[PDB]
Amino acid sequence: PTTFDALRRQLIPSFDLIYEAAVRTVAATVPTAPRVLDLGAGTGLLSAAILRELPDSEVVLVDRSELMLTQARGRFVTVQTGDLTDPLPEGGFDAVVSGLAIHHLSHTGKRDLFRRIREALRPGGVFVNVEQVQGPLPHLESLYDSQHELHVIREQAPAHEWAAGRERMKFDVCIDLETQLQWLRDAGFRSVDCLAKDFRFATYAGWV
Ligand SMILES: C[S@@+](CC[C@H](N)C(=O)[O-])C[C@H]1O[C@@H](n2cnc3c(N)ncnc32)[C@H](O)[C@@H]1O
Ligand SMILES: [Ca+2]
């Protein structure tokens, strides 16, 4: 379980910065013993970092991949098979968080999800996205990719893991940060901000 996380740091620029930024944003917002929804939770890496900071948290992990959720169950809290496009779990949440998941939805799916997240959030609640974002112009996307490659080089990520990541990027529907911040505003979030960024990777949030 520590080996994967070590691999994730090799593959993701500023992994600690962007994940911690989300944890700290949540921690500054939510009441003690908060209820948290983790969308596209995977192995539960984001749910874990939040629990470490806020041990009394009630966390609900959602992911369409049973294989991923099994390992999450293994790391650990509720776990649920579900698609991001499906209705969110009921009951309301103090925070909704997501890491490297939402960029797989169509732009129409993202905007609809943003609205449904807003509706799931209790007053004062926060949505935080740790996200892969697109360069706004081709030269910027080339720079973003170059910077990603520089990280993978420096951290000596295994060749096959980088190749697999490259492959999975063919299923991406990334867009630039500014556009999706605007969509947050459009979805009825009171305040939106980018907390942290390292070229292609960014943590942003909206409050209801
Ligand atoms: C790159 S992994 C991120 C895992 C975890 N959130 C993290 O930050 O380490 C993307 C995850 O999103 C999930 N996912 C992608 N599209 C999804 C969808 N439409 N509905 C549900 N889960 C989805 C995948 O199953 C996978 O577990
Ligand atoms: Ca992806």
Residue numbers in the entry: 15 to 90, 96 to 227
Provide excerpts from the study.
Here, we characterize the O-methyltransferases BelI and CysG, which catalyze the initial step of β-lactone formation. Employing techniques such as crystallography, computational analysis, mutagenesis, and activity assays, we identified a His-His-Asp (HHD) motif in the active sites of the two enzymes, which is crucial for binding a catalytically active calcium ion. As expected, BelI as well as CysGΔN16 adopt the class I methyltransferase Rossmann fold, characterized by a core domain of a seven-stranded β-sheet flanked by α-helices. The HHD-motif enables regiospecific C1-carboxy group methylation of their respective malic substrates.
The 2Fo-Fc electron density maps depict the cofactors at atomic resolution and illustrate similar interactions with protein residues of either BelI or CysG. Intriguingly, the crystal structures of CysGΔN16 and BelI revealed a His122-His123-Asp191 (HHD) motif with additional strong positive electron density, indicative of a divalent metal ion. Molecular analysis indicates that a flexible N-terminus in both enzymes likely plays a key role in substrate binding. Furthermore, phenylalanine in BelI and tyrosine in CysG, at position 18, act as gatekeepers (see below) and can either adopt an open or closed conformation important for catalysis.
